[PDB]
């Protein structure tokens, strides 16, 4: 069908199984002093984390104070200059002998791809740095809130003192 | 179109009667019993007329082929179209139907001329006999 | 190879986020009638803490199951209103999820 059937073990655990789970796990721990399914109550025991700390799904694999970059900058500048130079040479190829133009085209793309690889390694280095730009925005917002609070209560205190002087003069 | 037009007007008056009985039941105070009986009987006999007229013009309704308008936009009104163009019963009616099949033992896709046919013939005769018996009983005593 | 129970339970949890899946599951009488399914739903509650929450793909179901948790004391009735209510309350529920995680 369109919707896959519920998992099979779901139907094994009634309320009686839930209430008898404590004594079952106590007995299992006493006896113990891929997990084989010898009893229907085994699944409620929390599954163990794999030792490899890896998870595979759909053909893909998955697994501290925040809680030479100049070399990478100059490499990206020279790569951009070389990319412009290669674009000029490739368009010249199109001008004179376009029949073999593709021979350079993908080459240029490789450089673009290498710039994209630098810009990929650069993500775990920008994504966390978003929390930094957030840091200064809430910090400056709270400083503005604080400063307008001592300002307003100081101007209230000044008004009170002026009133006190006015009433003392009228005495 | 004439049959569907009559179907339309009668269904419209039936819906009007339903709206009526609705807004006189929605009041916090229940009216007199007799008014409720009158409304019930009128609306229910009107439903009977609806059923009978629907039964009369089955061929005109069957001949008609449903097609969306060229001017009607389905991109924006697909929800409205799918509201109207789906027609399954409420589940409590289909499970009631299944419970009725199970309780009666009736099932109508494999039946053939053996025991059920001799039972079918042996049922006709009780009805006719009872009808004749009650005609005789009515004739026995002068009711005029 | 045969996937472990981790994978199937995680995929079930992430598929619970679909409104169509929830409507289909609640359409059948014996799914809600059987206490086994709700027992499994309450068993699934323990994934809201780390490091299990780091393995989720769509955080919305995190509330949905919790919303489904509410369904055991709110009633089936309300199944029809489920798509409308999720569409209407998506903004504030997404905001509260962001407050729970992004802050």
């Amino acid at each position: 069908s369109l919707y896959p059937p519920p998992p099979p073990y779901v139907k094994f655990f009634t309320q009686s199984n839930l209430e008898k789970l404590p004594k079952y796990k106590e007995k299992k721990a006493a006896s113990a002093k891929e997990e084989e399914i010898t009893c229907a109550l085994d699944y409620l025991i929390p599954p163990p984390m794999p030792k490899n700390q890896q998870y595979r799904a759909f053909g893909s694999i998955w697994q501290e104070n925040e809680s030479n970059y100049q070399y990478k900058i100059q490499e990206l500048r020279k790569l951009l200059k070389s990319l412009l130079l290669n674009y000029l040479e490739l368009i010249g190829v199109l001008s004179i002998n376009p029949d073999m133009y593709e021979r350079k085209v993908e080459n240029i793309r490789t450089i673009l791809v290498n710039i994209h690889h630098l810009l990929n390694e650069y993500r775990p280095h920008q994504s966390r740095e978003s929390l930094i730009m957030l840091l200064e925005e809430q910090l400056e917002y709270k400083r503005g809130e604080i400063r307008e609070i001592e300002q307003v209560c100081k101007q209230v205190h000044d008004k009170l003192t002026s009133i006190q002087d006015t009433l003392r003069t009228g005495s | 179109g004439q049959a569907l037009d009559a179907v339309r007007m009668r269904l419209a008056q039936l819906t009007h009667s339903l709206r009526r009985i609705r807004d006189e039941m929605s009041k916090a105070e229940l009216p007199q019993w007799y008014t409720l009986q009158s409304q019930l009987n009128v609306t229910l006999s009107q439903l009977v007329s609806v059923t009978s007229t629907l039964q009369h013009f089955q061929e005109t309704l069957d001949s008609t082929v449903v097609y969306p308008l060229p001017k009607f936009p389905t991109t924006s009104h697909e929800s409205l179209v799918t509201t109207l163009l789906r027609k399954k019963n409420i589940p409590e009616v289909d499970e009631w139907m299944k419970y009725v099949r199970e309780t009666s033992g009736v099932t109508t896709a494999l039946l053939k001329d053996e025991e059920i046919e001799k039972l079918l013939q042996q049922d006709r005769e009780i009805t006719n006999w009872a009808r004749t018996t009650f005609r005789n009983e009515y004739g026995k005593h002068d009711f005029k | 190879p045969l996937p472990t129970r981790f994978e199937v339970e995680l995929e079930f949890i992430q598929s619970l986020a679909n409104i169509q899946y929830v409507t289909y599951l609640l359409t059948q009488q014996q799914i809600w009638k059987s206490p086994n399914f709700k027992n499994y739903l309450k068993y699934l509650e323990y994934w809201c803490n780390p490091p299990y929450s780091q393995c989720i793909v769509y955080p919305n179901c995190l509330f949905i199951l919790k919303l489904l948790n509410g369904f055991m004391e709110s009633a089936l009735e309300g199944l029809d209103e489920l798509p409308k209510i999720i569409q209407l309350q998506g903004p504030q529920w997404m905001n509260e999820m962001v407050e729970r995680w992004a802050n």
């Binding site: 369109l2 | 419209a12 799918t82 509201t83 789906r86 | -």
Partner: peptide, 25 residues
């Protein structure tokens, strides 16, 4: 003329019961 038109009694909240099954190829 027409004494009164009918009030709109639409029920979009109705969930419908369309059976879906031939999805797998």
């Amino acid at each position: 003329p027409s004494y009164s038109p009918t009030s709109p009694s639409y029920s979009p909240t109705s969930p419908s019961y369309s059976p879906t099954s031939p999805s797998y190829s």
